[PDB]
Amino acid sequence: ANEIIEIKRIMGEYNLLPDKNSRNGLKLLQKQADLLKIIMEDTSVTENTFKNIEIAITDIKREYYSHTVDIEKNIHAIWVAGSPPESISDYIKTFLKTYKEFTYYLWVDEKAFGAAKFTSVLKQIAFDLACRTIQQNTPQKNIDFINLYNEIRKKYNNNPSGQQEYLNKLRELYATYQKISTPLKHMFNSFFLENMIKLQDNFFNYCIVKGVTEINDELRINYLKNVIKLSDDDIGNYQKTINDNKDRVKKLILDLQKQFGENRISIKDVNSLTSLSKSENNHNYQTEMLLRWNYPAASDLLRMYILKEHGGIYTDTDMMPAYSKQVIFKIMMQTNGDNRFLEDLKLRRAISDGVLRYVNNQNIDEVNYNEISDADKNIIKKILTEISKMPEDSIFTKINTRIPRDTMPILRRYHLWPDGWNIRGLNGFMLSHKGSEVIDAVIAGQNQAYRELRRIRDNIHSEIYFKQTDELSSLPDTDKIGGILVKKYLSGSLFSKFRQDTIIPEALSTLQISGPDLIQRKMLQFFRSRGVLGEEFINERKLSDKAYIGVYKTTGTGKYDWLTPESIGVNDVTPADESTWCIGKGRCVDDFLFKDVSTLKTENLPELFLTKIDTDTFFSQWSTKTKKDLQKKIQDLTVRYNELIDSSTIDFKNLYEIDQMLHMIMLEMNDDIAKRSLFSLQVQISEKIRRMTIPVDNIINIYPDLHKKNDNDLSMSIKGFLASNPHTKINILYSNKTEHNIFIKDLFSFAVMENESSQEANEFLEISTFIYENDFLREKIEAVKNKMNSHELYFEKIKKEQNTWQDLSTKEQKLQLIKALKEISGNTEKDSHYDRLLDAFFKKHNENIHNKIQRIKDEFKEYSRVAIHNIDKVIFKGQTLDRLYHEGYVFSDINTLSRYTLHGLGITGVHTEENLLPAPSSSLINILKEHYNEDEISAKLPLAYDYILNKKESSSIPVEILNKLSELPPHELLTPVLGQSVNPLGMGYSSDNGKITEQVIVSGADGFDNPISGLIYTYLEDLYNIHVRMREGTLNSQNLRQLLENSVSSCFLTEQSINKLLSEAEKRPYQSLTEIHQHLTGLPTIADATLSLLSVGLPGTGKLLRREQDYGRPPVTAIQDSTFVLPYNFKGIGFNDNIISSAPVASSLHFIAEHAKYTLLSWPEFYRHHAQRWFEMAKGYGSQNIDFHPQSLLVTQEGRCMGLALLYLQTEDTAHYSILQENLMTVSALHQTSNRDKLPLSKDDNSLMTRTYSLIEMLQYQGNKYITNESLLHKTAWNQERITLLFNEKGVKRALISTPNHTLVLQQLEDIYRLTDPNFGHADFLSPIDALKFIEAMIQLTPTLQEYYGLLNKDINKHIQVHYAESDMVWNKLLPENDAGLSTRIQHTTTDRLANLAEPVAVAGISLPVKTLYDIGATLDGRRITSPPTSEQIPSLRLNGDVLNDYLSRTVLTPEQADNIRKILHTQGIRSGTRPIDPEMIRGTQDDLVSSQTRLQRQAT
C-alpha cells in the first residue's frame, strides 16, 4: 500500500513541474521505475495475471522518455608546455572550419610553465634518497647499478654540451637497471613513490607556513632555493623556459585570432576555475604535476574541471573530425574490394595526413609515406587527388549535438592490431553540459583514486611485498605505479622504439590512475545506481554501445560497416599521434633541469629526516636581532623537545607545554628563517603524533534500532563477530527509557493531530486521495510538523507528573495518562481512541521491544561473550545523559550521545549504531577471485557470508566454492576487531569520500591516556547547558559568554556564532544537541569539532593538522584500515581502504589443550625446576653474560608467547633492552600482586598493567599473522649452517625461532648475539653457530620442558621454523613504535614515586612517611592513595585490610612503628569491603647484637 500511495504522490508531483527535463524529474522517474520493479518482482498477492506483468513492462517502456538537453557551443583544449605551435595550429584550424558556431578555448596554465623543471628536480632528489636508503639497507652487497648511476652523475660535468649525452647515458643505464633482483626492484619502486609523496607534502607545508593561497612559479623557485642550493644560472634557465612558453602561446593565439577573428578562438586561464582551489579536491592538480608519466598528454583532472565548469566538447589537440559519407565512399571507389586502406593504421594515417595538408592549403603530396609499399603509395596519391578535387567544407562531418541529461559520451576507438580488433574507450574526446552529475561522480572517483594511491605513506602498517602472483582489472597497486615511474625516470620517455603491439602499451592504460578506465568504471557505477532506467546503458557488466560515441556497426558480416555508424565520432588516427612523438618528432628536452643533490638541506626536510636540535647549528641562519632574544628559550627548550621526539610514549602534559610555548615564540617574533625552523619543529611534532598508534581492546558495541522490521542483519553481525575471533566480547546496548519516551512522544503527537485491516487501509487511501483532490493538499503538511514540534515543546514546558515521572509504571497509572490525553485533545468526547485502542497500542509497543530483546537473548544464551546491557543501569545518577533521559529526549542523535557517555564511563572498543560485519580476509577474496571477477565480488560477498555463518547454501555460487569455504575455519576468513590500531589522540572515526562521520567510533585501549574523551565530556556538558538555556527562553550574549567562560569550548565564540545562536533560539527554542553544535561551531558533526577543541591545548600542531587535511592528507582522527563493512553494499569504512583489493592477511590463531597446566599458583614450578639446568646448558656452550628475568604474565602458551617475543625485537641496543627487561619485571610483579593475591592496585599501577596487556595481545595477534605469511617474512626450516650463513653472508640482525608452542628471539645486539627466551631470560654468544647449537640443546633439556614446547616425540629439524626479513625497516614497519614507553622510559611503581619524595605527613596525631602509609594501604573512596593527603582528607582516609594483612605477612615491623600503626588502626577504621585483622604487630625476635655490630661498622666507615 505504501508503494501504491508513493506512486500516486510521484505522479501527482511530476505532472506539475516548471520543467520536467531536469534533475528532480529524472530522480522521480528513476525511483518510480525502481519501486515498480520491486512491485512486479514481489509476489505479495500471488503473481497476479500475466496481463498485469505485461501492463507493467509496457508502462516501464513508456515512462522512460528522452529528456534531451542541448550542449553548450564550446570546444576546449589544454595547452601543454613545450608543444610546438605549428603542429597544433593545423588541428585548431580544422576544428574551427568544421564547427562554424562553436567557440574554441585554449586553456593555459600561465603560472606553471616551469613546473616541468621543478618536478624533475624533485624526481631526482627522490631517486637519490631512495638509492642512498637502499645502499644503506644492503651494506653487505655492492650494487653496481648505484655505482654506475653515481659515476654518471659525477661525469655530467659540462651542462650545455652534455645534457643530451647524460640523457642517452641514462637511457643505456636503464638496461643495466633491468638486471637486479626482483626484491630490489620492489624496494626502488616503493621508496621512489614514497619519496615523491614526502617531497610533495614538504612543498605543501612550505605553502602552509608561507600563507599563500595560490601556487605559482616564483613560489616554486623560492621552495627550490630553500631546499637545494639553486644558483642564478638555474633561475635563468627556469625563466628562459617560462618566457619561451609565453612567447609560443602568444604567437599561436595571435596567428589564429588573426585568421579567424578574436571572438571564435580565445585563451582561458585555468586558474579561473573554482575547482582548483576547492577543499574537496585538496589540490590533486599539483600532485598530478608530479605523479605523471605520460608527459606529452594533457592532465586528466583539468578535463573534468573544464567540462563541469563551462561544459561543451573537450578535444585533444591531436585529433581531426571524422570524415563524411562522401569522403568514405570515394575512398572505397578508389580501392575496389580492398578494405585494408580503411582498417590498417599506417594507410589511414597517411590518408589523414594528406587530407589535413589539403584542408590547410599546404603541399599535398609532401606526406611521409614511410615504410609504405609503392603500390599503396600510388593508390593513396590517387585517393588524395580525388579528395582534393572534391570541394572543402564537406569533408568533415559534425558529431551529434543533442545529449541525454546528465551523461558523458566517450569516444570509442577501433584499431586493427596483428592479433585482431582492439576496441577501447578514449578520454581524448568528451561531450557534456554545464554541471552534470556524471562529471561529479567521475571527479569523486578521481579523488578516491588519488587517496588510494597515497596509501604507501599515509598508512604506517602497509604491505611492502605482494609476490605479484596475479594482478589484473583496475590495479591501483603501488608497486606497478612505482615501476612505471622508475621506467619513465630512467629510460628517457615511454613509447621508445617499439611498444608491445602497434606502439600501444595497454598495460599503461589499465594502470593509469585517472585514465579512461576509471572514467568507464565510474560511469558504469553511476548507471547502475540510476536504477531500471540504467540497464539500457548496461551490457553484461560492461558499458553498452549507447554510452560511447563514434560506435560502428559490429555486424558487417566480416569486419565493420564504415558507412553508417550508430553515432558519429572523430578521426583519432592522426599523423601527430604518439607514433611520431616517440621517435620522429624531436623529444622535448627543455623539461629537464640537472641538479646535484649533494648539497641538500637535510635540516629543512622534517618529513624525510628526523633531526634533533642543538645549540650549535640550529641558529646558524637567524638574524642577530632575534638571536640573543629567543635563542635562550630554544636552548632551554632543547632538553625537553629532544626527549619528546625520541620517545616511545606521548606525555600529553609535556606535549601541551612544548607546543604552547613554541606557538608563543611564533606569535611574538618577526623573522622569516627562524620562523621556518620553528615550523619545521612543529611539523616534526605532528609527524611524531601521526606515527604513534595505540591498540583497541577487542570489544564491539552495537546500539541497534528496535523499530526496524528486519532483524536478521543484527543476528548476522553478532554471529560474524562471534566467529571472527574466540575472544571478542560483544555488547548490545539499549535503553528502556528511550523507547518509553519515544512511545509517549508518538502518543502526544497523535493526540495533537487529533486536535487539528484491509477496510482501514481502504478508508485511509480514500481519505488521502480526497484530501489530495482539494485544498487540504499542499497546505497543512508543514503545518502538521510545525504544530507537532511546537506542542512537543509546550508539553515539555508544562512539566507535570506525565513529564517528570514520564509514567514509567503504566500498570495502574494509565488512568491519569488517559485523562491528560483527553485534556490535551480537542475532541471533548469519551473513548475517542483513548480509553480504547490506546491500551492495545501500549501493549503492542512493550511486547515488540521486549520480544526483540528476548529473541536476541535466547539466540545467544549459550555464548557468555554476548552480553545484553541496559544503558539506564550503567550510567550514573545526575549525569548529562541521565538528565536527558529524565527530562525526555527523543532526537535521532540520542544514540550518539549514549555512545559518547558510555565510552566516558569506561567501556572501550568499537561503538557503532548499524550492524557492522568483519571484513573479508585475503584468503576469502583469493577463493572468490579464482572463479569470479573483481567487480562481482562486492555483489557475491553477501551470499558467501550467509553460507559461512548460517550454512545456507545458494544456487548462485558454484559448489566448488562452497566446498573451499567450508574447508577453512571461519576465523581464517573474517577479520577480527583485535589487531586494529588508532591514533594516540584517542577516539578514531569512520569516513566516507574523505569526510569523517559518526557511523563507527573506535576508541583506544583502556589504560592509555585519552584527551578526546575528556574534551567530549566537557563539551557535551556545555551543550546541555546551552540546551537548557534555549529551552527556558532566557538566553542572550552575556549569559552565553558567562556560561562558556571557563570551558575549553570558547574558541567558537565569535560574533556570527552569537547572532546565529540567538536567531535560532528566537525561531525554535527546543532544539537538539547536535543542531546546537552545528549552529555554534558551523561543523556538521561532533567528530569534526574534536580537533578544534584540541587546538586549544595544541595551538601550533592542532592548526597544522587541521590545515593539512585540505592538502591531500588524512584527518588525524580518521581510520586507515577498515576491518568492518556495511551490510548493504560491503564497502570499507576506512579513509583509503578498498576491501576487495587490499584485504588484510588472515591470522593463524594458536589453540592449546583444555587441561593446560601451570595455573597462576603453579606456574613458578617450571622456572623452579628448569632455571639451574638452563644456566648450566648456557655455560656449557660458551657465554660470558647470562641474565634471568622470567615472566609471569602468560602462564599458558596461548599465542606461543609471540607478543613478548616481539617486544624483545623492538629493542636494538643494550640500554633499551635493559630498560624493557626491568619494565617487564615490574609489570610481572604487579600482575602477580594483583591477580594471584587478589590485592587491589593503585590507579597508576593498574593502568600500566592494562597498557602492557593490551600491547601484548596486539603484538601476539600481529606476530601470529606475520608468521603464517610468506611475502612478509621468509620462513625457513631448521638448518644450522643455513642460519649461520644467513647471519654472516646475507646479513640479518633479528630472527624469530618458532616452535609449535613457543617463540625465541635471536638478535645481533652490538657484536654479541643475544638469544632471548621469555622464560629464563637471555644468553649472549660471540658467534651465531654457538647460539644455534644452544637453541637445539635447550629444546632437548627436560622431557617436561620439551613436551611443554610441543616438541615431544617429534623430529626437531622439521618442527622448528626461523622467520626473518630482508631489511630492518621491514621490522620497523611491522613493529609499532608506540609501546607505552616500555623500551625507552623506566616505569616507576607508585611505591617508588612515593619513596622518591621525603615528606612525612601528620595523621592521627603522629608522623608517618607517605611510603609507609601507602604500604599499609589507605583507601580514599575505595581507591589507594597516590598523593599525600591534606588536612581535609585525613578524617575520610579509611584503611585496607587485605593489603595490611599481607604487609604484616611480609615485614617484621619493629615496635617503633608498630605502635604508630596501632594508633592509626584504632583512630581510623576498616573499609567494609576488606576483612578485619587482629593487632599483632610486635617484634622481639633474636638479639640486637648484630644490630650493634652493623651500626658500629657504619659509624666506622
Author numbering: 242 to 997, 1036 to 1780
The authors write:
Long linkers hold these domains together and occlude the catalytic sites of the N-terminal glycosyltransferase and protease domains.
Vice versa, conformation I had disappeared, which suggested that conformation I was a low-pH form and conformation III was a high-pH form. The subdomain organisation of the C-terminal arm in conformation II was also maintained in conformation III. Concomitant with the reorientation of the C-terminal arm, the linker L-IV changed into an extended conformation and spanned the whole distance between the vertex domain and the distal end of LifA. In conformation III, the subdomains S2 and the C-terminus of S1 were adjacent to the protease domain. S1 formed several interactions with the N-terminal helix of the protease domain. Such an interaction can only occur at high pH when the histidine is deprotonated and thus can contribute to the pH-dependent stabilisation of conformation III.
